[PDB]
Amino acid sequence: AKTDSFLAIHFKQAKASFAALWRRPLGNILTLAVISMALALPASLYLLSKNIASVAERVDWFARLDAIRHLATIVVISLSSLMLMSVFLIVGNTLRFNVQANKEEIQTMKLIGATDAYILRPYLYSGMWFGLLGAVAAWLLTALMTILLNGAVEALAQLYDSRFRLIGLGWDESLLLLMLGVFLGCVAAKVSAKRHLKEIEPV
Amino acid sequence: AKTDSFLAIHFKQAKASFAALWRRPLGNILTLAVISMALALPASLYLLSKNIASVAERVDWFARLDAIRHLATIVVISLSSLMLMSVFLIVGNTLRFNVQANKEEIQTMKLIGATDAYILRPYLYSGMWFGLLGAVAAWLLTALMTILLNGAVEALAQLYDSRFRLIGLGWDESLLLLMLGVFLGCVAAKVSAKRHLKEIEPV
Amino acid sequence: GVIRFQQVSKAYRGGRQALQKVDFHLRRGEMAFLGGHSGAGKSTLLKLICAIERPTDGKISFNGHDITRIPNKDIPFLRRNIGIVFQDHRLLMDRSIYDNVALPMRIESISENEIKRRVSAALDKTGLLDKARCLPSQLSGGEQQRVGIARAVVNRPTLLLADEPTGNLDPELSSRVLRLFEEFNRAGVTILLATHDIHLVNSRPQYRHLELNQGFLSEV
Amino acid sequence: GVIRFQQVSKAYRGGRQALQKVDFHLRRGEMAFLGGHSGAGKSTLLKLICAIERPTDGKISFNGHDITRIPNKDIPFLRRNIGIVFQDHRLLMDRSIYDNVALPMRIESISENEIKRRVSAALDKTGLLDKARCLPSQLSGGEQQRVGIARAVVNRPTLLLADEPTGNLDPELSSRVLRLFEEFNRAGVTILLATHDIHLVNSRPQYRHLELNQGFLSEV
């Protein structure tokens, strides 16, 4: 009995899961938009913190400056923790809804003798795609926000007789953002799907 | 045939829908937490902007301060609009999942001859309770953030000897926050539930 | 009559046609079996009666009121008159029997005391009063079907439609269910049964028999 | 034998008991009807065979391998051997017939060409090869049931379990479905049918008949 290879089945699963996301446009576009905005917010907060820190470094007085940096770091970290926690939960809800949508298919698949891993892999890849697309959209949104802010910043820089310019996310930071997005999209999917799939019976 | 009064049925529906949220703790606690944090960001940002503006008012210097205020207002508005949109979108997903969970009940209810309004009102009140609880949780989150930040602000002020402390949200503002929360919880629920209810058939 | 058809016919989206020039008349109090083959159009005829699906060619009269183009907002008022029993004995496993039997009385707001007394009377009539507080799961198949019949009839419907109620029961319980239906008919409730078991219909020749063959109704 | 029971019994959570000291032996190639009443324990016996629910008292042997306490991870390997046909002709309305019949062959990764040829052979055997590309909705009830049987048998199962396959068909198509099952039995596939229709079983006395009455199996 001819059997497909490991990488062949994995690539087929990835392509099929990407195709499946567009079965329900309304159901899966809103979640992508929400993830994009939620992940973009902390990116913009970090961007502003980085810009102000660069300004401060570029410029009794020294002792007071460090405390302001500490306060800014605490605020940014708190908001980042909130938003990252938010992204984790929303992904789980969408996958739980998807699993409940495919109740009959999973029932029939389990009845015929399919292993749990076969049932589970498509949802892992769907979560990974959610994370990746959300990260890309968040990066685009942060770029647009920087473009928007530059106009206001120019007036302040001109009035101060300065040549200050906003600096966008570094190319090394974009890789970290994408890694975080896919990490959430995978971990939330695994945890929620594994915990929820157990409580579904073949009949 | 004795029939219940309008206010009686509405009150009973509100009470029963509130009781319904506790059918699924994991399903409906995560959404409340996400809404709380999302609606907390706008309030906390407004709090920070208000505090810095009050400090500036307390304090050539006139010209640049107006530009700084313009930049702060732009940043706050842009970052808050995203969270308002996210709260609007996320509420719809939870109610869509709930409606798909009650597929059989709605099928039987429509088959027996129930009007659409009877089917729909519980979801409207569930959305309203979502909004109200989210607003209350966001208010508490902002208060807790103020409590956390006050210690660091006091540590910073000791060096400056400013003797300045943060001040929490005003009572009038809290009413507006609750109104916004309930407004979103009602509007998103109405839109999503009404659009989705059409495509469920009795059999 | 309680229901009438005038040259009504239906064609599905694919082009296959369920009903062609089917015409029959039903007087209040009478009972009919509506026999047919595995295919034919027995279920569709029942769907058309209660406006789940609309017809194409003819017109439908419930009590002299045209149902051919009933607006979607007035469908619930019509459905309140008609009670439906299905083969799958559709029940809500989560809720109790008393809650399931009381759903039609709660769709239209009614005082709880009247709901209690009416549900108790209905379950006493069907003999399930004792287990009113139990869950559907603990009941046997026949008991679940009887609960479904009670829920269908609790609202004093003028016309009762059953779509193969005895699908999932052996012949022994078929007689009991059919005698329950006959008791309801004696009460004065018009009933239009639907089944393909020729033996059951041949057992009782009192009630007029309508044969639905390939979408045509001989009515003999 | 293909399946055996040793003093196996089951008691549900409520305390009602489906099976008590039921013992039977099945040799490869033989066919059985497993007649019973509306209640009794016919469905439970089928669930126990394929490890959907575990027993309490006795032990189950599939091919000399104990299934009494099969670990949950090894259940799929057992289920791959057993094919199941249900009364509801469980089918995926969204997908095409060819996709439904090919699901067992895709659960275990197989080359698409072999899947195509095997599905074509199975549908030719059941006579549905022509409509392989059509949706289940356009099919009639008997055609949907035959598609379900084909999907069950596509994977060369050693034992085929049918839970009242002829529930939703008139007697005319019952003979056709039973003759299809007899053809499969001639092919060499062990079959254990389950039905409560005494007429159908009485029609064909060649195959051994097991009567399940109130959880007890006379096997006569």
Ligand SMILES: Nc1ncnc2c1ncn2[C@@H]1O[C@H](COP(=O)(O)OP(=O)(O)O)[C@@H](O)[C@H]1O
């Ligand atoms: N939703 C549908 N789409 C396409 N064809 C249908 C649909 N429903 C029924 N049909 C076909 O039209 C006729 C109506 O089926 P039906 O009267 O329900 O059979 P039964 O009496 O056994 O329930 C049959 O030929 C059936 O195959």
Ligand SMILES: Nc1ncnc2c1ncn2[C@@H]1O[C@H](COP(=O)(O)OP(=O)(O)O)[C@@H](O)[C@H]1O
């Ligand atoms: N999930 C369950 N919970 C409680 N009792 C059950 C359950 N399933 C079956 N029973 C009871 O145990 C016995 C098994 O039912 P079953 O053998 O499936 O009847 P049938 O042969 O008509 O399918 C019956 O008495 C039934 O009422």
Ligand SMILES: [Mg+2]
């Ligand atoms: Mg039918």
Ligand SMILES: [Mg+2]
């Ligand atoms: Mg059964």
